[PDB]
Structure 1
Amino acid sequence: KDEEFPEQKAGEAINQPMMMAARQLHDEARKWSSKGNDIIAAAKRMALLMAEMSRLVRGGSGNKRALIQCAKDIAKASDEVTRLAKEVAKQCTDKRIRTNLLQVCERIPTISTQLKILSTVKATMLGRTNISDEESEQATEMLVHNAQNLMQSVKETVREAEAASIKIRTDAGFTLRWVRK
């Protein structure tokens, strides 16, 4: 059914924080079936792409273009998540839940744009042993922080969209399919 996620190695959280952030999104999205639910499909795609970004930043100058494209792909998926979350908010009859859902999903676009910017920075840095240790470390920290914020925001968006899909005045067939996997 779903694609498998990379095996977790000892020390992943500290050594590969973007992989851990990606794993947290995967863990949330895997609770649900992708059939009839493009938010979940997009979220699973995003977690796998971030896993790839994690692998790419540990490489050399040869991964420059791949790193940039990976960020591009992540942003495209994030735009799909935002669009679908907005529709679910529209169908939600609970004003509070609608507001909160819009609140969290509306931030995804800016975070993904920032991800593309920071990925580009790290990309042009890869393999160049002529760069300051401080500059390389801070670029990494910035990208890691942004990846964590994007994964956390998408994770919360999935959660709120699911609860919001129950607060509708039509039958279940008018919105995203939410069936536990």
Structure 2
Amino acid sequence: EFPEQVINQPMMMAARQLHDEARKWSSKGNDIIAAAKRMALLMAEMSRLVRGGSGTKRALIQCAKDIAKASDEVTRLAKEVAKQCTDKRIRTNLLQVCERIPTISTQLKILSTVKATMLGRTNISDEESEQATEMLVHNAQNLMQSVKETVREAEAASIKIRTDAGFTLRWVRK
């Protein structure tokens, strides 16, 4: 429900790739999916902000902060799922992929800051500015890839549950 194709093609691409993996499921009773959908929507806002020129400084910053908020919740919940999983194979893969999330999301706040201050500047070099933007896209690509890998191993680890009493996300295909 994001649509086909003044943004940043590769950020929107990454935004869309996450969106599609999470739109596969209903958000109802699955905050992992709700958060994932949110991040994807804020990633899209970012490719837009990445052209912004100015007035985008403050926004670009807030936006990156927003995103990190969303990942912190994907992680937090991914962990409760892993804590309920009874399959070492899966419980492991889950923790593995969701550990990096926080890190990637932090690189993202940092990279976005440099980018923000660079916005407006005329003195900054050509090579410097297109490079700032490409580390952003790179980090964004990997943040999205990580969030979507979680969601899939979160779903896999929803299968063998220690107690139906503990935590549970709702996995209902749309």
1:16 is displaced (CA, Å) by 1.6
Deviations 1:38-75 (A, max 9, x none): 00000000000000011001111221000000000000
1:151 is displaced (CA, Å) by 0.2
- Comparing 79-88 and 162-171, the one that deviates more: 162-171
Scaled by the length of structure 1, the TM-score of the pair is 0.91
The one of 99, 110, 113 aligned to 1:106? 99
Secondary structure (helix, strand or coil) at the match of 1:76 reads helix
Aligned twin of 1:54: 47
Q: Distance between the aligned counterparts of 2:23 and 2:47, measured in 1?
A: 20
1:27 is displaced (CA, Å) by 0.7
Aligned twin of 2:30: 37
Q: Distance between the aligned counterparts of 1:7 and 1:143, measured in 2?
A: 23
- How many residues align? The count is 174
Contact 1:6 1:51 in 2 (8 A): no
Secondary structure (helix, strand or coil) at the match of 1:128 reads coil
Contact 2:78 2:154 in 1 (8 A): yes
Q: Which runs of 5+ in 2 are unaligned?
A: none
Aligned twin of 2:4: 7
Deviations 1:11-44 (A, max 9, x none): xx99521110111100100000000000000000
1:170 is displaced (CA, Å) by 3.5
Q: Distance between the aligned counterparts of 1:14 and 1:120, measured in 2?
A: 18
**RMSD over aligned Cα, in angstroms?**
1.9
Percentage identity across paired residues of the two chains: 99
Scaled by the length of structure 2, the TM-score of the pair is 0.94
1:127 is displaced (CA, Å) by 2.6
Q: Distance between the aligned counterparts of 2:121 and 2:152, measured in 1?
A: 41
Does residue 89 of structure 1 match 2:85? no
Contact 1:26 1:44 in 2 (8 A): yes
